[PDB]
Amino acid sequence: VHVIIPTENEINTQVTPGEVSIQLRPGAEANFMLKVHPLKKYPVDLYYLVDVSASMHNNIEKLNSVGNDLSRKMAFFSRDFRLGFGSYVDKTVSPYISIHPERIHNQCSDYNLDCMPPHGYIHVLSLTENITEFEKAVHRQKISGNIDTPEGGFDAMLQAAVCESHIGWRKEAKRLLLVMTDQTSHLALDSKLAGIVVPNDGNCHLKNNVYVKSTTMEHPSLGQLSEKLIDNNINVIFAVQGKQFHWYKDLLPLLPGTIAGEIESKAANLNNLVVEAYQKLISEVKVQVENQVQGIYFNITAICPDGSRKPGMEGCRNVTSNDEVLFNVTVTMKKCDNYAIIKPIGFNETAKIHIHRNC
Amino acid sequence: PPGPLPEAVLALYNSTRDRVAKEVTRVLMVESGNQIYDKFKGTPHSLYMLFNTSELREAVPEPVLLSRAELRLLRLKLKVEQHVELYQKYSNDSWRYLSNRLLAPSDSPEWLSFDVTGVVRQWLTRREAIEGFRLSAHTLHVEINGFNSGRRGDLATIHGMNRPFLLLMATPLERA
Amino acid sequence: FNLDVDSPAEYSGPEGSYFGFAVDFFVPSASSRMFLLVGAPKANTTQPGIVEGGQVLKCDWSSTRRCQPIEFDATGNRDYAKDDPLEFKSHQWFGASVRSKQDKILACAPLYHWRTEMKQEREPVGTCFLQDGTKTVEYAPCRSQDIDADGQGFCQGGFSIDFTKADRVLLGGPGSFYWQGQLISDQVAEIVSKYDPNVYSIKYNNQLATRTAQAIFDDSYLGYSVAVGDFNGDGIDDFVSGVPRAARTLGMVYIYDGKNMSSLYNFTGEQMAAYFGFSVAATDINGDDYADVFIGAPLFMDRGSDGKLQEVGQVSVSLQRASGDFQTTKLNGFEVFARFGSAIAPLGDLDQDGFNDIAIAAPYGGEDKKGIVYIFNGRSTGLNAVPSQILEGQWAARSMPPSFGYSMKGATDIDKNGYPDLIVGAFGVDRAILYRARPVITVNAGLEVYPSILNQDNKTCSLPGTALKVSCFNVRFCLKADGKGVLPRKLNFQVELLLDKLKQKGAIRRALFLYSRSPSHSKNMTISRGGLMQCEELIAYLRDESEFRDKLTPITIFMEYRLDYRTAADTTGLQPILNQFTPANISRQAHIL
Ligand SMILES: *[C@@H]1O[C@H](CO)[C@@H](O[C@@H]2O[C@H](CO)[C@@H](O[C@@H]3O[C@H](CO[C@H]4O[C@H](CO)[C@@H](O)[C@H](O)[C@@H]4O)[C@@H](O)[C@H](O[C@H]4O[C@H](CO)[C@@H](O)[C@H](O)[C@@H]4O[C@H]4O[C@H](CO)[C@@H](O)[C@H](O)[C@@H]4O)[C@@H]3O)[C@H](O)[C@H]2NC(C)=O)[C@H](O)[C@H]1NC(C)=O
Ligand SMILES: *[C@@H]1O[C@H](CO)[C@@H](O[C@@H]2O[C@H](CO)[C@@H](O)[C@H](O)[C@H]2NC(C)=O)[C@H](O)[C@H]1NC(C)=O
Ligand SMILES: *[C@@H]1O[C@H](CO)[C@@H](O[C@@H]2O[C@H](CO)[C@@H](O)[C@H](O)[C@H]2NC(C)=O)[C@H](O)[C@H]1NC(C)=O
Ligand SMILES: *[C@@H]1O[C@H](CO)[C@@H](O[C@@H]2O[C@H](CO)[C@@H](O)[C@H](O)[C@H]2NC(C)=O)[C@H](O)[C@H]1NC(C)=O
Ligand SMILES: *[C@@H]1O[C@H](CO)[C@@H](O[C@@H]2O[C@H](CO)[C@@H](O)[C@H](O)[C@H]2NC(C)=O)[C@H](O)[C@H]1NC(C)=O
Ligand SMILES: *[C@@H]1O[C@H](CO)[C@@H](O)[C@H](O)[C@H]1NC(C)=O
Ligand SMILES: *[C@@H]1O[C@H](CO)[C@@H](O)[C@H](O)[C@H]1NC(C)=O
Ligand SMILES: *[C@@H]1O[C@H](CO)[C@@H](O)[C@H](O)[C@H]1NC(C)=O
Ligand SMILES: [Ca+2]
Ligand SMILES: [Ca+2]
Ligand SMILES: [Ca+2]
Ligand SMILES: [Ca+2]
Ligand SMILES: [Ca+2]
Ligand SMILES: [Mg+2]
């Protein structure tokens, strides 16, 4: 029974030791200290996932000014700031949309408006250093619509999170998925009403930058959504204008690595909301462990800057740059029968622990 | 912040050319679920259109500043025909003939316009809070955009778009 | 514990039809034979121009296993006007929900669309067909003049149905009034009598229904899933309805008075997006004569000690008490993303123990997410939280998960043996399977030793062959057994008696039977079930103190029994199972003093 910390040069800048090797016997335990040191001036990838359903027609134009102004504000929080853009509405199936031939491709037809055909999720702009391109992509964006109040937000989010090769998310960046909406989102089983009885497999299904399984697969569950967001190291910011802000706020305990705030009725805080959410997310440190090793139990306690202790993934708050947080990791073997991964949520570095054992 | 246009500006630009040294503004009708059906009701022979006089005055505050006014309605597919008449409100409780129209069997939505310059000027002068128009069949089977409250859900808000309005033209105060 | 999972009856439908999506039993009051009803919502019908209309098939059971469609609707889309269709039956999902009471079969098509007379629309109103006797009528309670989303235009009536013991039809239509949802309850007599094929909107006189409410209740989907049972002691089944997106998507279950729709009870979930109320069921699970309520919440996340949340699914089980109060406990799922609690189906008294048993599915659990059905036995204190039997799907995904356990129905005895059977759908593979319940044998095994106190010098008998005087004791045992259904009168049991086994293997046994000179003895026993215990006596002696580990020791007397399983079968080859809640290993002791 032992714990070995490699003496090799670390390949991690924030989370060390990058690798840990231990040996256990049943009834025995070993421990180590995991250190996390958040950086200043992170490269930041901000992707805008915008609700473009009819209820958002008063808000889409408010994004015409979240390009250059945001880029300037982020100059003091980031090293390299890129913007991307896409949009979502709902599943293009009955009963969520009208299927009448004269309005199926223009749900707003009855009001004599020129609305964009309804769609699930469309990727418009890959993350880019060119702010002008972002603004252009927004300025030429049309408004769509559907019938039912709830929108396919979670479905679009999953695709935005998993389709890394299409979005252009960088590993060497803080990945921020910004979701703009007003109403609540659909849940995994709501789709039964549309005759969709096939679980979301969590994979990437974009064809020509368009999600094409939106009418065959149901909405993702919160379980699946948080699983994929954490796995792809994506931090989520919910920006909600309506009273439903509170609905999203109260889902936060179920979705680790997620923050939510409110959009003002005049959308005067769109850039302030993104900046505050970013600054708040970087001050929260918590880890979780993916334990695929049978017979092994993990017990992790966070040691916070003020000397307080917080168990498991409860996390430490008010952590700054040049401020280290320690996690005391105890690993114990209970029974005879690989490795486990301990990672900070929202970080692009992990600690991999290999467990040798004998009986 | 030059470059893009806001919805209000682009919409006005297109509105002034939708029907086929002055400033132009628009005053939109009051929501039917807010005021139109609180003063009376809709009936299967007539329709009411109410406007907020204070809101109008904010755009054109004086009876001697107004140069022109038009009442704009969006007619929906009619198919065959309808003969209707438009009335002005007097003494806050009476209606009198103003003008009328023979409505064509349109296939698509179309904007109609009436010259109401004199009407608006009189209502602008009158120290009243509520002004409006009445339309009726010469029995009424022509639908126009808006005038409903049973529409909610995602399209709840766009319901108020392209609703009837007064298009007002007036002399700039600077030009006098 | 008594389902036969070794030789179940497997049925299949057309590929891609979702055969097995919805399953029920069909039992005409006096036709002598029973059928299984299996829906296939995406099946290709013979209807003139209808694509994937959906159908319900009536599957036989005895002798062979074949299924044939029921011609509830043999026509196509009726016109409203020349070259202007009234209705759209393609992709209506007929067979999505099927229920039957005696000879009355109600099958629904929740995705049926129609235009209404006012304007040329395409609204998903939903329709059902009720077949009884020799007549079939169309029931379409939401196909009225109250149209569009503000009305019943998007009702999807027939999404979920059940039957009231009073001969009423309870129908959920979750899309009504901007998805507030509506329950509609009518009479069978009115549905059949007030019928005219030339009339699209039909009024009924004895219909009960919910009404509209404030916009704050929009998108709740009331009537997503329904069940019935008496929750107020009036003798009239009341209406239980899931409302999965209610209360800030916590989910709720409502109980409405079955006579006047006055609301009686409200159950609310704890966790957002657990989708509490997805499915509901009602049955007496504790023998108290009061229906108990089972509420599924398939997306429930159960946090561990480290704060990590695992999506497992949950079922809320609440017992009804005379005071009007409910006693609620919680049953959690066992596997992540298996969606435990997505389907709940009362089995009736599966093991005939006096308490009803219930099946709860987890359609995406098990190896390769084939699907698992868990059988939970009842008892006087409420449902036993520990499952007694595990049913695993036997098919692999071809394009989608088999979803074994997606739809289940029990409490009907098809093989007529007194023990109700269970039908489980697996629509992802277009299959349905019937598991039959084995008879249960409860065994009373007796064991005595005479005397319990003896010693090495207490010479009381002589050995066979050579009359050597030895110390002795008599070993007595007896056996009785019975069941409550159809069991063979003669039960063939294998029994074995062991002496002085309480020691290290290889050690010399001191207590041996006189005739066999062995620490063990066995017999083939045939007993009459329900009769008196059959008795036998063996005589044992002790070896002297030349071969021993100690001198004063316990002598254990041990008896074990099991079934023969060669002659123990009914006329279909279905074998009985011993009660799994009783020991088949019993003991007594004698001592050397
Ligand atoms: C299980 O949980 C459900 C809720 O999920 C609960 O059912 C709800 O019961 C409440 C009543 O407690 C329903 O709310 C309203 O009830 C009034 C009846 O009068 C009461 O309330 C008024 C206050 O308004 C008091 O003064 C009075 O003394 C009573 O306490 C109804 O009249 C209401 O009807 C409205 O809707 C109708 C059409 O839908 C309208 O025609 C009618 O005019 C009302 O309109 C309202 O809203 C308008 C805006 O849209 C507004 O302009 C009007 O002025 C007015 O405010 C209404 O029914 C509630 O709807 C029930 N909800 C559901 C989903 O059924 C169960 O009782 C509970 N069960 C148990 C056992 O606890
Ligand atoms: C950022 O993107 C803008 C386009 O949004 C680029 O500007 C264009 O440059 C091309 C020449 O390559 C001209 O033909 C276009 O007319 C320009 N468009 C506009 C709107 O100015 C700009 O050069 C890009 N900048 C960088 C550094 O890549
Ligand atoms: C985690 O993110 C950090 C940046 O915040 C990555 O570190 C940078 O890697 C690039 C590689 O081209 C270097 O040029 C930078 O100088 C590094 N930054 C610092 C502050 O040292 C890090 O590599 C990411 N983790 C992984 C596993 O890729
Ligand atoms: C990290 O956790 C270990 C427990 O695994 C701590 O070790 C214990 O420290 C207390 C101090 O009061 C002793 O009484 C125990 O006997 C130690 N026990 C073990 C290994 O069983 C360790 O001190 C913690 N480190 C920090 C920095 O908090
Ligand atoms: C019911 O019949 C239709 C029509 O033949 C089937 O739909 C076709 O499926 C083939 C094979 O994938 C496609 O190449 C055709 O283009 C489809 N036609 C249409 C009109 O969609 C449908 O799959 C059949 N359904 C079942 C359950 O058998
Ligand atoms: C894990 O650590 C906490 C202290 O934060 C302690 O209370 C708890 O008992 C520990 N659990 C195990 C299983 O070691
Ligand atoms: C806690 O956060 C506040 C800002 O909200 C900051 O002013 C304060 O210094 C922080 N405390 C510590 C100990 O870092
Ligand atoms: C429904 O019936 C019960 C039982 O008689 C009665 O107490 C209740 O007041 C009735 N409610 C309505 C709305 O008729
Ligand atoms: Ca919607
Ligand atoms: Ca009752
Ligand atoms: Ca009970
Ligand atoms: Ca039982
Ligand atoms: Ca049986
Ligand atoms: Mg919307």
Q: Please name the residue that has the structure tokens 């992509």.
A: A137
Burial level of C430, CB count in 10 A (0-12/13-18/19+)?
A: buried
C-alpha A58, offset from chain centre: 26
Q: How far apart are the first and last CA of chain C?
A: 45
Closest CA to A192 of C101, C496, C156: C156
Residue C436: partners with Cβ closer than 8 Å, 6 or more residues away = C3, C4, C8, C9, C414, C415, C417, C419, C421, C574
Q: Are C277 and C266 in contact (CB under 8 A)?
A: no
Number of helices (H), then strands (E), in chain C: 3, 45
C-alpha dihedral sign at C154, C159, C160, C164: positive
Which H/E stretch holds residue C193? helix C188-193
Distances (CA, A) of C7 to A30, C150, C572: 50, 52, 11
CATH label, B29-146+164-170, candidates 3.10.105.10, 3.90.1170.40, 2.60.120.970, 2.40.100.10? 2.60.120.970
Q: In what order do the strands lie in the sheet with C554-563?
A: C453-454, C585-592, C554-563, C490-499, C520-528
Atom of ligand 8 nearest to the CA of C234: 4
Beta strand ranges found along C463-519 (DSSP E):
469-482, 490-499, 511-513
Burial level of A136, CB count in 10 A (0-12/13-18/19+)?
A: middle
C-alpha dihedral sign at A336, A337, A341, A342: negative
Rounded Cα distance between C249 and C109, Å, is 26
Letter for the amino acid at C553?
T
Residues C520 and C430 in one domain: no
Inter-axis angle of helices A153-162 and A222-231, nearest 10: 30
Rounded distance from Cα C466 to ligand 11 centre (Å) = 67
**If you count them, how many residues does chain A have?**
359
Q: Are C76 and C49 in contact (CB under 8 A)?
A: yes
Rounded Cα distance between C507 and C510, Å, is 9
What is the 3 state secondary structure string of A248-286?
HHCCHHHCCCEEEEECCCCCCCHHHHHHHHHHHHCCCEC
Say if strands A174-181 and A42-51 run parallel, antiparallel, or are unpaired.
parallel
What is the 3 state secondary structure string of C503-516?
CCCCCCCCEEECCC
Q: Are C364 and C406 in contact (CB under 8 A)?
A: no
Going from N- to C-terminal start, the domains of chain A cover 1-38+286-359, 39-285
Q: Are A13 and A49 in contact (CB under 8 A)?
A: no
Please tell me whether the peptide bond between C439 and the residue prior to it is cis, using omega within 30 degrees of 0: no
Q: Are B23 and B169 in contact (CB under 8 A)?
A: yes
C-alpha C223, offset from chain centre: 22
Burial level of A210, CB count in 10 A (0-12/13-18/19+)?
A: middle
Q: Are A210 and A176 in contact (CB under 8 A)?
A: no
Rounded Cα distance between C107 and C97, Å, is 6
Domain that holds residue C592: 439-593
CB < 8 Å & 24+ apart, contacts of C396-399? C396/C368, C396/C370, C396/C429, C397/C368, C397/C369, C397/C370, C397/C428, C397/C429, C398/C428, C398/C429, C399/C428
Residue C586's CATH number: 2.60.40.1460
What is the 3 state secondary structure string of C97-155?
EEEEECCEEEEEECCCEECCCCCCCCECCCEEEEEECCEEEEECCCCCCCCCCCCCCCC
Residue ranges of the annotated binding site of C for Ca(2+) are: 230, 232, 234, 236, 238, 284, 286, 288, 290, 292, 349, 351, 353, 355, 357, 413, 415, 417, 419, 421
Residues C413 and C518 in one domain: no
> At A236, is the secondary structure helix, strand, or coil?
strand
Closest CA to C24 of C9, C13, C35, C40: C35
Residues C443 and C319 in one domain: no
Rounded Cα distance between A127 and A43, Å, is 12
C-alpha dihedral sign at C294, C298, C300, C303: positive
> At B35, is the secondary structure helix, strand, or coil?
helix
> At C430, is the secondary structure helix, strand, or coil?
coil
Neighbours of chain C (3+ CB pairs under 8 A): A, B
Rounded Cα distance between C216 and C60, Å, is 48
Two structure tokens written together for C450: 């005479």
Interface contact B4-A53, CB threshold 8 A: no
Rounded Cα distance between C21 and C107, Å, is 12
Q: Are C432 and C408 in contact (CB under 8 A)?
A: no
Residues C298 and C154 in one domain: yes
Query: How many CB pairs below 8 A link A and C?
Result: 105
Query: How many CB pairs below 8 A link A and B?
Result: 53
Q: Please name the residue that has the structure tokens 């909301």.
A: A273
Residue C53: partners with Cβ closer than 8 Å, 6 or more residues away = C43, C44, C45, C47, C73, C89, C90, C91, C92, C94
Number of other residues whose CB lies within 10 A of the CB of residue B133: 23
Closest CA to A3 of A328, A343, A335: A328
Residues C452 and C424 in one domain: no
Two structure tokens written together for A133: 């391109």
Q: What is the CATH number of domain A39-285?
A: 3.40.50.410
Helix ranges restricted to H, chain B = 7-15, 37-39, 53-59, 117-125
Two structure tokens written together for B30: 């009051």
Q: What is the radius of gyration, based on Cα positions, of chain A? A: 22
Distances (CA, A) of A69 to A235, A270, A272: 22, 10, 10
> At A9, is the secondary structure helix, strand, or coil?
coil
* Residues in chain A whose C lies over 2.5 Å from the next residue's N (breaks after): 337
Residue C116's CATH number: 2.130.10.130
What are the DSSP calls for A43-104, one per residue? Answer: EEEEEEEEE-SGGGTTTGGGGGGSSHHHHHHGGGTEEEEEEEEEEE---SSTTTS---TTTT
Burial level of A161, CB count in 10 A (0-12/13-18/19+)?
A: buried
Two structure tokens written together for A30: 């070993």
Considering only the beta carbons, identify the residue of A65, A90, A112 that sits closest to B145.
A112
Closest CA to B119 of B78, B66, B82: B66
Residue A252: partners with Cβ closer than 8 Å, 6 or more residues away = A258, A259, A260
Rounded Cα distance between C318 and B34, Å, is 46
Two structure tokens written together for C462: 């002589």
Q: Distance, in angstroms, between C273 CA and closest chain A CA? A: 7
In this structure, the dihedral spanned by the alpha carbons of residues C142, C147, C148 and C153, taken in order and rounded to 10 degrees, is: 10
Nearest-CA residue of chain C relative to B149?
C150
What is the 3 state secondary structure string of C342-359?
CEEEEEECCCCCCCCEEE
Q: Please name the residue that has the structure tokens 């993916």.
A: A290
> Count of domains in chain C?
2
Chain A partners within 8 Å of C299 (Cβ): 187-189, 221-223
Closest CA to C74 of C103, C60, C94, C59: C94
Closest CA to A69 of A264, A266, A261, A271: A271
Residue C546: partners with Cβ closer than 8 Å, 6 or more residues away = none
Q: How far apart are the first and last CA of chain A?
A: 11
Residues C403 and C462 in one domain: no
Q: Are C171 and C184 in contact (CB under 8 A)?
A: yes
Residues C80 and C161 in one domain: yes
Atom of ligand 2 nearest to the CA of A130: 1
Which residue among C438, C461, C484 closes a domain?
A: C438
Residues C129 and C1 in one domain: yes
**Nearest-5° Cα angle at C495, C489 to C500:** 155
Q: Are C46 and C27 in contact (CB under 8 A)?
A: no
Closest CA to A159 of A88, A248, A249: A88
C-alpha dihedral sign at C380, C382, C386, C390: positive
Residues C135 and C256 in one domain: yes
Q: Are C145 and C164 in contact (CB under 8 A)?
A: no
Helix ranges restricted to H, C502-573 = none
- Cβ–ligand 4 distance for A299 under 6 Å, the answer no
Q: Are C479 and C525 in contact (CB under 8 A)?
A: yes
Q: Are C424 and C39 in contact (CB under 8 A)?
A: no
> At A196, is the secondary structure helix, strand, or coil?
coil
φ, ψ (nearest 5 deg) of residue C450: -125, 115
Which H/E stretch holds residue A157? helix A153-162
Residue C82: partners with Cβ closer than 8 Å, 6 or more residues away = none
Q: Are C265 and C259 in contact (CB under 8 A)?
A: no
Tell whether B161 lies on the interface with A, counting CB pairs under 8 A. yes
Q: Are C572 and C433 in contact (CB under 8 A)?
A: no
Residues C417 and C468 in one domain: no
Distances (CA, A) of C333 to C311, C315, C316, C324: 9, 8, 11, 28
Two structure tokens written together for A91: 């599943």
Residues C146 and C293 in one domain: yes
Tell whether B2 lies on the interface with C, counting CB pairs under 8 A. no
In this structure, the dihedral spanned by the alpha carbons of residues A19, A23, A28 and A29, taken in order and rounded to 10 degrees, is: -10
Question: What was the experiment behind these coordinates?
Answer: cryo-EM
Residue A273: partners with Cβ closer than 8 Å, 6 or more residues away = A237, A239, A261, A262, A263
Rounded Cα distance between A83 and A135, Å, is 9
Q: Distance, in angstroms, between A220 CA and closest chain C CA? A: 11
Rounded Cα distance between C365 and A69, Å, is 50
Which of A71, A124, A132, A136 for mutating ligand 2's site (highest number of atoms within 8 Å of CB)? Answer: A132
Two structure tokens written together for C402: 């088999």
Q: Are A47 and A86 in contact (CB under 8 A)?
A: yes
Which H/E stretch holds residue A164? helix A164-167
Q: Please name the residue that has the structure tokens 């891609």.
A: C16
Rounded Cα distance between C312 and C101, Å, is 34
Which H/E stretch holds residue A156? helix A153-162
Rounded Cα distance between C125 and C177, Å, is 12
Rounded Cα distance between C272 and C276, Å, is 9
Tell whether A202 lies on the interface with C, counting CB pairs under 8 A. no
CB atoms within 5 A of ion ligand 9 belong to: A 90, 146, 148, 151
**If you count them, how many residues does chain B have?**
176
Pocket residues for ligand 5 (CB within 6 Å)? C 14, 16-17, 42-44, 51-52
Closest CA to A54 of A95, A100, A106, A102: A106
- Cβ–ligand 8 distance for C232 under 6 Å, the answer no
Q: In what order do the strands lie in the sheet with C263-268?
A: C225-229, C238-243, C252-256, C263-268
